[PDB]
Amino acid sequence: IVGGTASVRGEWPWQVTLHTTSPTQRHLCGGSIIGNQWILTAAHCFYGVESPKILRVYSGILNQSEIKEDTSFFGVQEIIIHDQYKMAESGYDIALLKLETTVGYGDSQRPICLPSKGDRNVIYTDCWVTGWGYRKLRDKIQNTLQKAKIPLVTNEECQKRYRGHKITHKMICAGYREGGKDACKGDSGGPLSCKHNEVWHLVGITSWGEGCAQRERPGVYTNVVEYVDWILEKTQAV
Ligand SMILES: COC(=O)Nc1ccc(NC(=O)[C@@H]2c3ccccc3CCN2C(=O)/C=C/c2c(-n3cnnn3)ccc(Cl)c2F)cc1
C-alpha cells in the first residue's frame, strides 16, 4: 500500500495472507474470507503454482512477524480459477481457495459480505484497500497490515486513464486523480472493502495497475458484484 497507515488489530478480520512454501516460505498475495472454507483472491497469484500443497493461508494476522514455523494456518484443498481467465489485464482475475479445514469465526477472523445484485446501482463513498505490499515501486513486503481510503472511479474515467486497454464493467477502478494512495506489489488478491449502511462489502479484488499510486493511473480491481453467481456456483455446488 502506497500512502497508507498501519491498521489496528481486528480492523479487517476478513483479510488473509496467502503464503507459498516453494522454494522458501514467503507472503504471496492477499485474500478475503467469504465463507467458513472459502478464500476469495486473484487468479494471477497462482502463475506457476503447480499444486495447492505449497500454499498456506493465515487469518487473524496484523503483523507478518506473527508467522513462524509453529503458527497455525489453513491448508488449501483446491484452487479454483475462473475458466475465462487469461491475464489480469484482460479480466476474470478471480480465484477461490477451498480450505482443508473450517475457519472458526471470532473477533480476529470473520467473513466479509459479498455485494448484492440490487447494490449494483449503489454509490460507494467509503472504500479501503488493505495489504502487506510495498509502499513504493522499489520496496519490500511490510510487517504491519496497511490501509488506504481511496475513491472509486467510473468505468468511463478509468478507460481514459488506460488507452490501449479495454476496461470492462467486470473491472472497477479506484484512486485519486493526483495519485499518492493505491495498492502496490504484494497487495494483489486482497480486498477493496466498502462500508455501506454500516455493513462492509467486498466490492473489489486488487488486480493490476500501471505502476503504484501514479497520477491518473487508478488501481484496477475485479468488480466482485459481477461474479456473485460464479462464486455461488463454485461454493454452493450440490
Ligand atoms: C522477495 O519477496 C518479495 O519481493 N515478495 C513479493 C511478494 C508479492 C509480490 N506480488 C506481486 O507483485 C503481485 C503478483 C503476485 C503473483 C504473481 C504476479 C504478481 C504481479 C502483480 N502483483 C501485485 O501485487 C499487483 C500490483 C498492483 C499495482 N502495481 C503495479 N505494479 N506494481 N504494483 C498497482 C495497482 C494494483 Cl490494483 C495492483 F494490484 C511481489 C513481491
Coordinates of N, CA, C and O and ligand atoms in Angstrom, one line a residue, residues 26-29 44-47 129 134 137 139-141 162 182-189 205-213 218-221, ligand 1:
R26 N 7.2 -17.5 2.0 CA 7.0 -16.1 1.9 C 5.6 -15.7 1.6 O 4.9 -16.5 1.0
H27 N 5.2 -14.4 1.9 CA 3.9 -13.9 1.5 C 3.8 -13.9 0.0 O 4.8 -13.4 -0.7
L28 N 2.7 -14.3 -0.6 CA 2.5 -14.4 -2.0 C 1.4 -13.3 -2.4 O 1.6 -12.5 -3.3
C29 N 0.2 -13.4 -1.7 CA -0.9 -12.5 -2.1 C -1.8 -12.3 -0.9 O -1.7 -13.0 0.1
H44 N -4.3 -14.3 -10.9 CA -2.8 -14.1 -11.3 C -1.8 -14.6 -10.2 O -0.7 -14.8 -10.5
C45 N -2.3 -14.6 -8.9 CA -1.4 -15.1 -7.8 C -0.9 -16.5 -8.0 O 0.1 -16.8 -7.4
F46 N -1.6 -17.3 -8.8 CA -1.2 -18.7 -9.0 C -0.4 -19.0 -10.2 O -0.2 -20.2 -10.6
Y47 N 0.2 -18.0 -10.8 CA 1.1 -18.2 -12.0 C 2.3 -19.1 -11.5 O 2.9 -18.8 -10.5
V129 N -8.5 0.0 0.6 CA -7.6 -1.1 0.0 C -6.6 -1.4 1.2 O -6.0 -0.5 1.8
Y134 N 4.2 -3.4 -0.9 CA 5.2 -2.3 -1.0 C 4.6 -1.0 -0.8 O 3.4 -0.8 -1.1
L137 N 7.3 1.6 -5.6 CA 7.6 0.6 -6.6 C 8.8 -0.3 -6.2 O 8.8 -1.5 -6.5
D139 N 10.5 -1.5 -3.1 CA 10.4 -1.6 -1.6 C 10.4 -3.0 -1.2 O 11.2 -3.8 -1.8
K140 N 9.7 -3.4 -0.2 CA 9.6 -4.7 0.4 C 8.2 -5.0 1.0 O 7.5 -4.0 1.3
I141 N 7.9 -6.3 1.2 CA 6.7 -6.7 2.0 C 6.8 -6.0 3.4 O 7.8 -6.0 4.0
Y162 N -6.4 4.6 -19.2 CA -5.8 3.4 -19.7 C -6.0 3.2 -21.2 O -6.7 2.2 -21.6
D182 N -2.7 4.0 -3.1 CA -3.1 2.8 -4.0 C -2.4 1.6 -3.5 O -1.6 1.6 -2.7
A183 N -2.8 0.4 -4.1 CA -2.2 -0.9 -3.9 C -0.9 -0.9 -4.6 O -0.6 -0.1 -5.5
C184 N 0.0 -1.8 -4.2 CA 1.3 -1.9 -4.9 C 1.7 -3.4 -4.8 O 0.9 -4.3 -4.4
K185 N 2.9 -3.8 -5.2 CA 3.4 -5.2 -5.2 C 3.2 -5.9 -3.9 O 3.6 -5.4 -2.9
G186 N 2.4 -7.0 -3.9 CA 2.1 -7.8 -2.7 C 0.8 -7.6 -2.1 O 0.4 -8.3 -1.2
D187 N 0.0 -6.6 -2.7 CA -1.3 -6.3 -2.2 C -2.4 -7.1 -3.0 O -3.5 -7.3 -2.5
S188 N -2.0 -7.5 -4.2 CA -2.9 -8.2 -5.1 C -3.6 -9.4 -4.5 O -3.0 -10.1 -3.7
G189 N -4.8 -9.6 -4.9 CA -5.7 -10.6 -4.4 C -6.4 -10.2 -3.1 O -7.5 -10.8 -2.8
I205 N -11.4 -6.9 -5.9 CA -10.2 -7.7 -5.7 C -9.1 -7.0 -6.3 O -9.1 -6.8 -7.5
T206 N -8.0 -6.6 -5.5 CA -6.8 -5.9 -6.0 C -6.2 -6.7 -7.2 O -5.9 -7.9 -7.0
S207 N -6.2 -6.1 -8.4 CA -5.8 -6.8 -9.6 C -4.5 -6.3 -10.3 O -3.5 -7.0 -10.3
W208 N -4.6 -5.1 -10.9 CA -3.5 -4.6 -11.6 C -3.5 -3.0 -11.7 O -4.4 -2.4 -11.3
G209 N -2.4 -2.5 -12.2 CA -2.3 -1.0 -12.5 C -1.0 -0.7 -13.2 O 0.0 -1.6 -13.1
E210 N -0.8 0.5 -13.8 CA 0.4 0.9 -14.4 C 1.2 1.6 -13.3 O 0.9 2.7 -12.9
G211 N 2.2 0.9 -12.7 CA 3.0 1.4 -11.6 C 2.2 1.4 -10.3 O 1.1 0.8 -10.2
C212 N 2.6 2.2 -9.3 CA 1.9 2.2 -8.0 C 1.5 3.6 -7.6 O 2.4 4.5 -7.6
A213 N 0.2 3.9 -7.4 CA -0.3 5.2 -7.0 C 0.2 6.4 -7.9 O 0.4 7.5 -7.4
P218 N -5.4 5.0 -12.0 CA -6.1 4.3 -10.9 C -5.8 2.8 -10.8 O -5.4 2.2 -11.8
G219 N -6.0 2.2 -9.6 CA -5.8 0.8 -9.4 C -6.9 0.1 -10.1 O -8.0 0.7 -10.2
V220 N -6.7 -1.1 -10.7 CA -7.8 -1.9 -11.3 C -8.1 -3.1 -10.5 O -7.1 -3.8 -10.1
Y221 N -9.4 -3.3 -10.2 CA -9.9 -4.3 -9.3 C -10.9 -5.2 -10.0 O -11.6 -4.7 -10.9
Ligands
LIG1 C1 11.2 -11.5 -2.2 O1 9.8 -11.1 -1.7 C2 9.1 -10.2 -2.4 O2 9.6 -9.3 -3.0 N1 7.8 -10.5 -2.4 C3 6.7 -10.1 -3.2 C4 5.5 -10.6 -2.8 C5 4.4 -10.4 -3.6 C6 4.5 -9.7 -4.8 N2 3.4 -9.7 -5.6 C7 3.1 -9.1 -6.8 O3 3.9 -8.5 -7.4 C8 1.7 -9.4 -7.4 C9 1.8 -10.7 -8.1 C10 1.7 -12.0 -7.4 C11 1.8 -13.1 -8.1 C12 2.1 -13.1 -9.5 C13 2.2 -11.9 -10.1 C14 2.1 -10.7 -9.4 C15 2.2 -9.4 -10.1 C16 1.2 -8.4 -9.6 N3 1.3 -8.2 -8.2 C17 0.7 -7.2 -7.4 O4 0.9 -7.1 -6.2 C18 -0.2 -6.2 -8.1 C19 0.1 -4.9 -8.1 C20 -0.8 -3.7 -8.3 C21 -0.2 -2.5 -8.7 N4 1.2 -2.5 -9.2 C22 1.7 -2.3 -10.4 N5 3.0 -2.6 -10.3 N6 3.2 -2.9 -9.1 N7 2.2 -2.9 -8.3 C23 -0.9 -1.3 -8.8 C24 -2.3 -1.4 -8.7 C25 -2.9 -2.6 -8.3 CL1 -4.6 -2.6 -8.1 C26 -2.2 -3.7 -8.2 F1 -2.8 -4.8 -7.8 C27 5.7 -9.1 -5.1 C28 6.8 -9.3 -4.3

